[PDB]
Write a protein that holds these residues in place. Structure first.
Motif, mmCIF file in Angstrom:
data_model
loop_
_atom_site.group_PDB
_atom_site.id
_atom_site.type_symbol
_atom_site.label_atom_id
_atom_site.label_comp_id
_atom_site.label_asym_id
_atom_site.label_seq_id
_atom_site.Cartn_x
_atom_site.Cartn_y
_atom_site.Cartn_z
ATOM 1 N N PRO A 29 -2.972 -34.299 -36.183
ATOM 2 C CA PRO A 29 -4.303 -35.209 -35.713
ATOM 3 C C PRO A 29 -5.420 -33.804 -35.436
ATOM 4 C CG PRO A 29 -2.761 -34.731 -33.539
ATOM 5 C CD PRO A 29 -2.110 -34.622 -34.918
ATOM 6 N N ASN A 30 -6.138 -33.850 -35.872
ATOM 7 C CA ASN A 30 -7.497 -32.717 -35.901
ATOM 8 C C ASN A 30 -8.465 -32.906 -34.574
ATOM 9 O OD1 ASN A 30 -9.398 -31.076 -36.163
ATOM 10 N ND2 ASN A 30 -10.079 -31.755 -38.079
ATOM 11 N N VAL A 31 -7.157 -31.934 -33.155
ATOM 12 C CA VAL A 31 -7.692 -31.791 -32.220
ATOM 13 C C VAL A 31 -7.468 -29.913 -31.636
ATOM 14 C CG1 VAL A 31 -7.045 -34.362 -31.832
ATOM 15 C CG2 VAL A 31 -5.329 -32.665 -31.388
ATOM 16 N N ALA A 32 -8.218 -30.262 -30.335
ATOM 17 C CA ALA A 32 -7.588 -28.789 -29.750
ATOM 18 C C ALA A 32 -6.238 -29.575 -29.040
ATOM 19 C CB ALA A 32 -8.485 -28.502 -28.996
ATOM 20 N N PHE A 33 -5.747 -27.736 -28.852
ATOM 21 C CA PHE A 33 -4.188 -27.454 -28.738
ATOM 22 C C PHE A 33 -3.843 -28.398 -27.198
ATOM 23 C CE2 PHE A 33 -5.803 -23.118 -28.089
ATOM 24 C CZ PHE A 33 -5.215 -23.532 -26.322
ATOM 25 N N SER A 34 -5.436 -28.304 -26.583
ATOM 26 C CA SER A 34 -4.996 -29.041 -24.779
ATOM 27 C C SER A 34 -4.897 -30.020 -25.308
ATOM 28 C CB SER A 34 -6.255 -28.528 -24.528
ATOM 29 O OG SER A 34 -6.748 -27.660 -24.681
ATOM 30 N N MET A 35 -5.026 -30.566 -26.343
ATOM 31 C CA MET A 35 -4.557 -32.439 -26.340
ATOM 32 C C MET A 35 -3.691 -32.599 -26.332
ATOM 33 S SD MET A 35 -7.681 -33.677 -26.017
ATOM 34 C CE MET A 35 -7.988 -35.027 -27.258
ATOM 35 N N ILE A 36 -2.453 -31.856 -25.985
ATOM 36 C CA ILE A 36 -1.154 -32.068 -25.940
ATOM 37 C C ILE A 36 -0.802 -32.775 -25.195
ATOM 38 C CG2 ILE A 36 -0.014 -30.114 -25.330
ATOM 39 C CD1 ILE A 36 2.690 -29.846 -26.864
ATOM 40 N N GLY B 194 13.840 -40.646 -22.743
ATOM 41 C CA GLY B 194 14.028 -39.438 -22.847
ATOM 42 C C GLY B 194 13.409 -38.799 -23.998
ATOM 43 N N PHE B 195 11.962 -39.180 -23.697
ATOM 44 C CA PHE B 195 10.780 -37.664 -25.524
ATOM 45 C C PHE B 195 10.582 -36.898 -24.432
ATOM 46 C CE2 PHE B 195 6.812 -38.721 -23.814
ATOM 47 C CZ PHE B 195 6.995 -40.283 -22.404
ATOM 48 N N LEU B 196 9.712 -35.861 -25.632
ATOM 49 C CA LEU B 196 9.377 -34.725 -25.127
ATOM 50 C C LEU B 196 8.395 -34.530 -26.678
ATOM 51 C CD1 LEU B 196 10.818 -32.261 -27.250
ATOM 52 C CD2 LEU B 196 11.883 -31.834 -25.383
ATOM 53 N N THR B 197 7.161 -33.880 -26.316
ATOM 54 C CA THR B 197 5.997 -33.405 -27.384
ATOM 55 C C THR B 197 6.111 -32.130 -27.591
ATOM 56 O OG1 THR B 197 5.115 -35.974 -26.650
ATOM 57 C CG2 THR B 197 3.737 -34.297 -27.589
ATOM 58 N N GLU B 198 6.104 -31.295 -29.086
ATOM 59 C CA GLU B 198 6.047 -30.408 -29.124
ATOM 60 C C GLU B 198 4.669 -30.030 -29.971
ATOM 61 O OE1 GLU B 198 9.949 -27.976 -27.741
ATOM 62 O OE2 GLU B 198 10.462 -29.099 -29.737
ATOM 63 N N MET B 199 4.666 -29.409 -30.534
ATOM 64 C CA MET B 199 3.389 -28.678 -31.056
ATOM 65 C C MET B 199 2.915 -27.472 -31.766
ATOM 66 S SD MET B 199 -0.081 -27.808 -28.963
ATOM 67 C CE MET B 199 0.267 -26.541 -27.402
ATOM 68 N N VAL B 200 2.604 -27.217 -32.879
ATOM 69 C CA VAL B 200 1.853 -25.827 -34.207
ATOM 70 C C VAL B 200 1.202 -25.699 -34.037
ATOM 71 C CG1 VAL B 200 2.293 -24.383 -36.160
ATOM 72 C CG2 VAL B 200 4.599 -26.406 -35.343
ATOM 73 N N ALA B 201 0.260 -24.773 -32.693
ATOM 74 C CA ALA B 201 -1.070 -24.508 -32.802
ATOM 75 C C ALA B 201 -1.706 -23.626 -33.171
ATOM 76 C CB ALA B 201 -1.414 -25.232 -32.108
ATOM 77 N N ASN B 202 -3.142 -22.775 -32.805
ATOM 78 C CA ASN B 202 -3.416 -21.925 -32.984
ATOM 79 C C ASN B 202 -5.175 -22.035 -32.324
ATOM 80 O OD1 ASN B 202 -5.779 -22.582 -35.134
ATOM 81 N ND2 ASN B 202 -3.801 -22.601 -36.384
ATOM 82 N N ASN B 203 -5.303 -21.246 -32.204
ATOM 83 C CA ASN B 203 -6.226 -21.108 -31.031
ATOM 84 C C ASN B 203 -7.729 -22.531 -32.040
ATOM 85 O OD1 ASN B 203 -6.572 -19.464 -28.980
ATOM 86 N ND2 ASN B 203 -7.943 -18.364 -29.469
ATOM 87 N N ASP B 204 -8.053 -22.337 -33.014
ATOM 88 C CA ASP B 204 -8.434 -23.594 -33.697
ATOM 89 C C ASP B 204 -8.395 -24.669 -34.128
ATOM 90 O OD1 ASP B 204 -10.559 -20.827 -34.900
ATOM 91 O OD2 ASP B 204 -8.318 -20.935 -36.150
ATOM 92 N N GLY B 205 -6.924 -24.610 -33.783
ATOM 93 C CA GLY B 205 -6.655 -26.189 -33.680
ATOM 94 C C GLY B 205 -5.032 -26.660 -33.771
ATOM 95 N N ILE B 206 -5.280 -27.509 -33.953
ATOM 96 C CA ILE B 206 -3.330 -27.963 -34.079
ATOM 97 C C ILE B 206 -2.861 -28.615 -35.479
ATOM 98 C CG2 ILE B 206 -1.369 -30.313 -33.032
ATOM 99 C CD1 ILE B 206 -3.162 -30.087 -30.730
ATOM 100 N N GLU B 207 -2.015 -27.780 -35.863
ATOM 101 C CA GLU B 207 -1.112 -28.038 -37.367
ATOM 102 C C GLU B 207 -0.441 -28.877 -36.789
ATOM 103 O OE1 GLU B 207 2.032 -25.687 -39.920
ATOM 104 O OE2 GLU B 207 0.368 -24.600 -38.742
ATOM 105 N N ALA B 208 0.333 -29.128 -35.955
ATOM 106 C CA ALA B 208 1.518 -30.124 -36.090
ATOM 107 C C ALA B 208 1.465 -31.102 -34.334
ATOM 108 C CB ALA B 208 2.348 -29.739 -36.710
ATOM 109 N N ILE B 209 1.815 -31.992 -34.461
ATOM 110 C CA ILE B 209 2.430 -32.735 -33.403
ATOM 111 C C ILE B 209 4.060 -33.016 -33.651
ATOM 112 C CG2 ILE B 209 2.965 -34.154 -32.023
ATOM 113 C CD1 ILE B 209 0.587 -33.049 -30.496
ATOM 114 N N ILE B 210 4.795 -32.571 -32.359
ATOM 115 C CA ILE B 210 6.443 -32.766 -33.203
ATOM 116 C C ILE B 210 7.008 -34.114 -31.565
ATOM 117 C CG2 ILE B 210 8.420 -32.905 -33.429
ATOM 118 C CD1 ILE B 210 6.078 -29.573 -33.880
ATOM 119 N N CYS B 211 7.662 -34.941 -32.019
ATOM 120 C CA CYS B 211 7.557 -35.521 -30.367
ATOM 121 C C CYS B 211 9.124 -36.613 -31.357
ATOM 122 C CB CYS B 211 6.771 -37.550 -30.380
ATOM 123 S SG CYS B 211 6.769 -38.035 -29.235
#
Ligand SMILES: O=C1N[C@H]2[C@H](CS[C@H]2CCCCCc2cn(Cc3cccc(F)c3)nn2)N1
Length: 318
Positions: free
Chosen positions: A138-145, A185-202
């Motif tokens: 998703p092309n969103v800010a890292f806040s959106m995790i 059970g599930f967890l949501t992780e992410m690879v991100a920087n200041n300019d946005g999220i490179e990947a969501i890993i669920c």
């Protein structure tokens, strides 16, 4: 064999019709005897195939084993996933996902029958469970995790619910229960920087083909399986297809809606109200009651001392 899942893919693809051994032979450019050998072994691995003379073979039922060739049909038509990696074994689908995403922008998921080093939140630690990691972009800010975690919660819940006679409910923010029994059970992780999220890993772990009967006679007091709440038998593939369809529906919701829209639905599906909860954060444990899930996915708690907490995330025990 070299051609097992191609034969499987052809058998699955042609349901509900019978398909001849000659057709399979012509399709893969192998002999009709080589096909018989594959189909025989397919049967001895537990595949249920009906073969009648002159007409051919009909795949009636898949065993409790992930087959790459079958899952490739799911990603073939998927408007979301580009591919999938199916394993009989691996250290962790999450570890595999975090490696495979590097250097590309493809959406995929990773499935494995068993995990030798499965890890959940805080690094906490048979073919009777579903272990899947999902990579989205998703092309969103890292806040959106935090917000993504809320949406797929309902997705996973809806899928399990469709197969469960008893009502399936969410223990915010990372677990699913049927009655007193935790089923997922599930967890949501992410690879991100200041300019946005490179990947969501669920990463998603679900107690599956554990037909009343089945599931391991251990903690029958706070762990359960999908199928201990389904009269009919539970087919993993029927479940997985429903689960992927729900993940995609909730993912598009995550992209198009504020949490306000699904908030009341989330509260109706939560099992954390009207009971004393145990909160762990770092050193300290403390008891509290959940007051509300606010407009932003923050849990509003009043602890045993009357003080108020507003938590993006929490480690909750009943
Ligand atoms: O490696 C991996 N992770 C992911 C993926 C696929 S499955 C996924 C993690 C699934 C986590 C759910 C199972 C679970 C429950 N619990 C509760 C617990 C355990 C120990 C102490 C404690 F306080 C609470 N822990 N794990 N691949």
């Amino acid at each position: 064999s070299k051609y097992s899942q191609d034969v499987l893919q052809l058998l699955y693809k042609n349901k509900p019709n019978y398909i001849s051994g000659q057709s399979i032979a012509e399709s893969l450019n192998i002999s009709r005897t080589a096909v018989k050998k594959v189909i025989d072994q397919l049967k001895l691995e537990g595949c249920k195939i009906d073969s009648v003379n002159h007409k051919g073979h009909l795949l009636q039922q898949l065993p409790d084993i992930w087959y790459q060739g079958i899952i490739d049909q799911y990603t073939k038509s998927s408007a979301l996933f580009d591919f999938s990696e199916v394993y009989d074994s691996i250290d962790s689908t999450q570890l595999a996902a975090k490696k495979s995403l590097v250097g590309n922008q493809s959406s995929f998921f990773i499935l494995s029958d068993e995990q030798t080093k499965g890890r959940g939140r805080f690094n906490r630690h048979k073919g009777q469970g579903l272990w899947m990691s999902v990579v989205l972009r998703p092309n969103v800010a890292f806040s959106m995790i935090s917000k993504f975690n809320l949406f797929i919660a309902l997705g996973i819940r809806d899928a399990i619910q469709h197969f469960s006679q008893d009502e399936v409910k969410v223990k915010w923010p990372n677990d699913i229960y049927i009655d007193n029994g935790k089923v997922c059970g599930f967890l949501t992780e992410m690879v991100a920087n200041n300019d946005g999220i490179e990947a969501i890993i669920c990463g998603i772990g679900i107690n599956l083909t554990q037909q009343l009967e089945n599931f391991d006679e251990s903690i029958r007091h706070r762990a359960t399986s999908i199928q201990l709440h389904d009269k009919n038998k539970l087919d993993r593939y029927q479940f997985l297809e429903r689960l992927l369809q729900e993940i995609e529906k909730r993912y598009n919701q995550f992209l198009t809606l504020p949490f306000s829209e699904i908030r009341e639905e989330y509260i109706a599906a939560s099992n954390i109200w009207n009971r004393t909860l145990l909160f762990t954060e770092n050193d300290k444990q403390f008891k509290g009651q959940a007051i509300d899930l606010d407009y932003d996915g923050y849990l509003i708690v009043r602890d045993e001392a009357g003080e108020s907490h507003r938590l993006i995330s929490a480690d909750i025990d009943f």
